[PDB]
């Protein structure tokens with residue numbers, strides 16, 4: 001396997017790092033969420049394979065500063081001769097970061113993540129970074145491409161007109177040397193743009209906030225105004241493309257004839273062929289494709305990639321050719337499609353689970369050398 | 370005088386390049402438009418100063434390949450001693466470019482711009498590129514900052530909350546260690562993002578098409594639908610923020626009471642205190658700030674800079690505090706301003722004429 005993540009106890013992780021396969025350069029990585037963090041070491045294997053060994057920590061104190069205790073424990077327990085092989089240290093955190101060094105504040109954790117407070121043995125000076133979740137996820141998409149297994153983790157929804165001019169390899173086999181917009185439609189709607197800088201031969205990841213933009217209309221002014229009156233706020237993309245959004249779409253389908261359902265309930269009903277829930281899912285994806293059509297114009301991407309557990313878990317929806325035709329039609333529903341802008345773009349979807357954030361911490365550390 | 374662009378005849382340019390001040394390394398630059406090109410040489414002076422000398426060429430044949438005849442004429446006329454000093458060659462063209470080497474196709478010009486067809490005396494190997502004009506414009510904003518005279522060329526419209534959190538120097542004194550969204554509201558509406566890579570402190574120019582985005586509403590559904598019915602297209606930002614857009618705003622302000630005027634006429638009447646033309650300019654700037662409020666959220670810029678001759682020529686509008694306060698209010702008219710996102714951003718406007726494209730060709734050549 002090209003992408004390998006083993007989860008162990010701290011004590012077992014220490015035994016694994018003394019084995020001969022681990023007597024190589026290391027990257028220290030950490031994927032920090034609201035409840036737990038998964039931290040450890042990544043190495044290269046054969047044919048650009050990626051091998052990670054990580055341990056889980058509970059964020060017991062609901063305090064981002066507790067990470068420093070975890071880092072100190074790792075350095076205290078591991079032999080200095082193992083930690084000496086660390087060449088880079090990258091974590092992702094569930095909130096905004098500045099200077100790649102100062103993360104927060106956070107919705108569900110107290111305090112600020114400060115790279116200058118982290119131990120230099122795991123975070124070597126000038127070869128370390130803190131990333132936002134979506135920035136790490138974008139670097140994770142690049143990592144999958146670099147490991148030659150894009151076609152294992154991503155499926156082509158449709159090939160856009162630009163692909164064969166810009167690239168030699170088949171669509172979906174590599175990320176491509178063109179801008180890649182990463183969208184993460186889940187509870188909310190994360191976005192990041194993977195740019196290739198010709199001058200530097202570097203890819204970089206630009207975190208965005210596309211989800212918080214005001215939804216522009218098509219022929220849906222009454223539908224937008226319905227949600228406007230409910231929220232008391234002009235709707236943004238995430239308001240239509242979110243759990244809350246899917247709940248809204250389902251309420252607007254059934255018009256009081258059925259009880260209101262959660263996003264989870266609705267997706268389950270859709271998977272079972274319920275006409276109402278399927279219609280709610282079509283409406284959710286109509287607004288997702290609106291983000292896509294407008295960002296296709298604004299950002300001129302070669303590719304749009306839909307990532308996350310939700311996308312993988314909803315594979316039934318993307319495999320259905322009628323749903324795919326309806327999504328493609330909405331992706332092209334833009335006045336600028338008379339010039340071909342929306343049809344230029346190749347759309348892909350994640351089809352296999354992977355911790356993209358852990359892989360992206362690793363991939364980001366490679367550009368720090 | 371830290372940034373100096375002088376226009377000369379070809380013969381006077383040849384005489385100038387033989388003077389002692391020009392006996393230094395040179396960059397060959399060219400700003401290619403639909404009707405003319407300005408091309409010439411740039412040198413560094415004292416204190417990171419920039420000095421350029423350029424000539425105007427007519428794009429008589431409306432054919433991008435005519436540039437090669439201009440390049441060959443310059444090489445034939447200049448002494449070998451002058452051409453020997455050229456260490457980089459960068460031009461910008463009004464259309465898409467791939468691999469920094471192949472430009473076009475173009476709306477207003479025939480043919481394809483091919484770097485591989487250009488003479489190596491003006492475009493030395495490893496050191497040459499073709500740029501899209503939006504890219505060149507963003508490199509030009511960086512050039513101004515690098516020459517230490519941002520406060521000469523750009524005025525602060527208002528300072529946002531984020532500036533003082535990552536810069537100690539006054540707002541408008543330098544580009545800043547943050548994303549800069551460049552907007553060029555002129556005949557149309559150009560956009561690029563000068564992205565800031567925190568991990569290596571690198572500014573990277575990323576051309577965009579924000580003008581072609583469908584306009585999201587505020588309390589203006591009727592106004593947008595009036596334009597929709599005229600264009601038979603859902604309005605995009607450029608449709609409201611363009612010469613055509615200003616002519617539209619003036620038509621709607623007067624409600625038939627005056628015949629239509631051109632965009633230039635409207636700006637002139639506004640400068641003279643005509644209430645109708647002033648209201649038309651307010652409406653233009655209201656949609657320009659909508660681009661700003663939405664992009665302030667989507668792209669999280671440190672700064673937004675309004676560039677171009679049109680901005681400099683309309684100085685009177687931005688000098689008026691009532692107009693500036695009404696622009697500030699629209700810039701903050703976003704649901705996400707309840708969290709302070711729009712108040713983060715510093716807005717600046719170009720206040721002195723400068724060919725940013727020619728400066729960007731130079732500054733891009735420094736990154737090669």
Ligand code: NA
Pocket residue numbers: 008009010055056057
């Ligand atoms: Na553990």
